[PDB]
Amino acid sequence: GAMEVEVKLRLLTAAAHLRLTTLLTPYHLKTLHQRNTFFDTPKNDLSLRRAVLRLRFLQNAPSPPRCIVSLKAKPTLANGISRVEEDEEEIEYWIGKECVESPAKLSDIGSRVLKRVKEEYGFNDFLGFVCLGGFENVRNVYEWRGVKLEVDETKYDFGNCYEIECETEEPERVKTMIEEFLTEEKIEFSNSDMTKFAVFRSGKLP
Ligand SMILES: [Mn+2]
């Protein structure tokens, strides 16, 4: 895959998130409704090898829903900056849905990314895989001061979490730009130290 580098900051409260979305209103591009689902063996073979296999179902708020398969490998997350190798590929929506119900059916897709999972992690098929479940996220996308901001409201059983992300080749300068703005506007933030999947799997608020 290619390297995804992003600024990743946590917004500390629902009020902070609301204030930020209000402030960013003029810059709004689109709102995405995402359902993230994840797959691994019962022995956590992918996780143990620093890999996450996600099927994301998405819908923009013609607008057909989409399913994107992602393999993310060898992530780092430190000081508000994420770097991870990512491979993504669109698959048919109805096929993705079938796989959530019956993970073995991942074996029946002619997918580039799923072939890469088989080859790189030593599987001949997905008969041994389970669905770990998943969670919903609402992503607001803004075009602001030359960057694309993604503001996330992530819905877990144990509560919601809120983040601001920005994919960029200049993560230090962009992180500074964002932090200065949040500080001036008195919005509560910190570095994000956990991925959404890691929060999900922990079963508790970070
Ligand atoms: Mn992200």
Residue numbers in the entry: -1 to 59, 66 to 210
Tell me, in the authors' exact words, what the paper reports.
The Vtc4p β-tunnel domain is not unique to eukaryotic polyP polymerases but is a structural hallmark of triphosphate tunnel metalloenzymes (TTMs), whose characteristic features are the presence of a topologically closed hydrophilic β-barrel, the preference for triphosphate-containing substrates, and for a divalent metal co-factor (PFAM families CYTH and VTC).
As AtTTM3 efficiently hydrolyzes PPPi in the presence of Mg2+ ions only at neutral or basic pH, we used two crystal forms grown at pH 5.0 (form A) and pH 7.5 (form B) to crystallize substrate-metal complexes under non-hydrolyzable and hydrolyzable conditions, respectively. Here, PPPi coordinates a Mg2+/Mn2+ ion that acts as a bridge between the substrate and the invariant Glu-169AtTTM3. A short soak at pH 7.0 (form B) shows the same arrangement of PPPi and Mn2+ in the active site. In all our structures the catalytic Mg2+ ions can be substituted by Mn2+ ions, for which we calculated phased anomalous difference electron density maps from data collected near the Mn-K edge to confirm their modeled positions.
